[PDB]
Structures are given as C-alpha cells and as structure tokens.
Amino acid sequence: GSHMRNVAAEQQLRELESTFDGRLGFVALDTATGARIAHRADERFPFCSTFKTMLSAAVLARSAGDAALLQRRIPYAKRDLVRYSPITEKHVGAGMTVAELCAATLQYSDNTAANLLIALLGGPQAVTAYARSIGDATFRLDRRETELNTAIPGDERDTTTPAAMAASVRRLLVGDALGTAQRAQLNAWMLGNKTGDARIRAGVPAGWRVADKTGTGDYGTGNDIGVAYPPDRAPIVFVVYTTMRSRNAQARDDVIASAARIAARAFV
Numbered sequence: 001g002s003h004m005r006n007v008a009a010e011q012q013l014r015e016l017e018s019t020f021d022g023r024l025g026f027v028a029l030d031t032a033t034g035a036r037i038a039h040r041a042d043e044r045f046p047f048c049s050t051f052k053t054m055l056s057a058a059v060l061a062r063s064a065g066d067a068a069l070l071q072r073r074i075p076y077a078k079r080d081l082v083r084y085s086p087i088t089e090k091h092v093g094a095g096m097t098v099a100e101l102c103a104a105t106l107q108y109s110d111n112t113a114a115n116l117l118i119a120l121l122g123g124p125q126a127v128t129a130y131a132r133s134i135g136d137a138t139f140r141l142d143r144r145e146t147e148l149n150t151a152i153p154g155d156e157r158d159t160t161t162p163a164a165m166a167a168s169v170r171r172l173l174v175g176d177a178l179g180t181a182q183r184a185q186l187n188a189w190m191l192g193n194k195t196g197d198a199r200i201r202a203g204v205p206a207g208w209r210v211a212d213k214t215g216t217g218d219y220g221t222g223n224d225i226g227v228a229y230p231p232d233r234a235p236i237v238f239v240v241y242t243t244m245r246s247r248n249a250q251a252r253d254d255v256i257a258s259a260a261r262i263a264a265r266a267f268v
C-alpha cells in the first residue's frame, strides 16, 4: 500500500462513477493504518437493508444485559408478513427465536424478521439511539420495512453517509462497539450472508472472507457494507452505496463489485 495508490484509487472511483447515471458513495478502510479510499464520503445515501447490521447489533447489545433475550420466541401470523420474508414465512404461528430472526434478517435480508426486531427494541428510534451510543451521529432509522427503501435528494429519512457507516461497521465487527462474544456472533452471522455473492465478495480475492450486508431499493439503489478478512493481514472495511438518477433504474452489482475491487487492489 501507498498514498499514491490510494489517491489513484480515488481517481478510479471517479471514473467508475462517470460510467453510469448515478452516485457512488464509497469508503474503504485498511485497518492496519486507518488509510482511507473514499468517494462522496460525507454525502447522505438511502441505506436500505444495510441497516439490518445496526439493528442486529442493537439486539445483541440489549441481550448483553437481558438474560435469554436471544432465546425468546416471537409469534406472528401469516397476515403479519411483510413483502420478502423468505425465512419467516416458513415459521408462521409459534414464530422464531430472536437469534434466529437476527440470522434471517442478516443472511437473507428477511423483512418480517427486521420488523419484528425493530418492534422488540421499541421502534425505529431505538435503532437510531443505538447508533448514537456507538458514536454514529449520522445514521437515522425513521421507517420500517419495506417503506424505508422507497422514494415518495432532499429526503434524509433512513439515510447515512459512507464515512459514518464505515466507522460504525469497523467499530461493530473489528473494534470496540460490542462485547467480545457479541462481536463474534455478529461476525458469525454476517460471514454467512447469502445475498452478497455479486457485490463486495465478487471484488476481492478468493481467500478473503467477507462479513457483509447488502441493500437494494428504489432508484436502482444497490448497497453493500462489511469487512473483508485476508488470512495474512489486517481486515479491510468496505462501504459501498450506489443510487441512480432514474426511478426506473436497475441496481448495478457490477459497479459495486468494481468499486470494491479498486480498493482491494490498492490496499494489497
């Protein structure tokens, strides 16, 4: 790694953004030194499902002082299901444990699981309050699934910046936001993600294991956040937010993977 390479990488990100009609928000952090590669680091983007990492962390933090919270089973009916409930739709009735709901929302992006957990914590503002408690003054959760993914720009609801989210992801997965057992559990879940094969994972070498959470929304919004763990050097934090100008736009997995690849190559 070198300063020269990082500056060149930021230029490559500018060039990558020029290839599509949208915005690229990007922060990668090499935790060996805190070196950063960024683009639009301080602009707000809709986080979409990437908030499920902050949500699950809040649940884990509560569980640290709330005996057997993770084992509590929350019942729900078929009429309670939100659009896109690939795991929870199989357990209607008695429901699933809090731990199982965290796993479902992180690994499959299950929306009913997310809403059940948001409600358990006392509403969206409890997730925001948790973010504040780990030093994130930027993150805000205002709505539930699936409304938080939608456009009804100037709307700041359900947004964060790439820089704020990178710091929070670093603190949660590598640093000192959670207790050691809780940090290990969050990593364990996110390393098992099933929805990110075409995003950050597609931009890093085959030996780097990636704990990530994706997000997708209106205006072709395509996001992925997480940490890559090389076997032989310090973890690297990746935050990629993309959103398009056209409401009809598709998300761009290829752009997300290319952005990650730019930083992975520059750092190592």
Ligand SMILES: CC(C)(O/N=C(/C(=O)NCB(O)O)c1csc(N)n1)C(=O)O
Residues within 6 Å of the ligand: 048, 049, 050, 083, 084, 108, 109, 111, 146, 149, 195, 214, 215, 216, 217
């Ligand atoms: C598939 C993919 C990308 O998308 N997930 C959703 C969904 O609502 N995601 C909210 B979030 O991932 O931003 C979804 C709604 S209908 C459907 N199929 N998927 C995901 O699970 O990650």
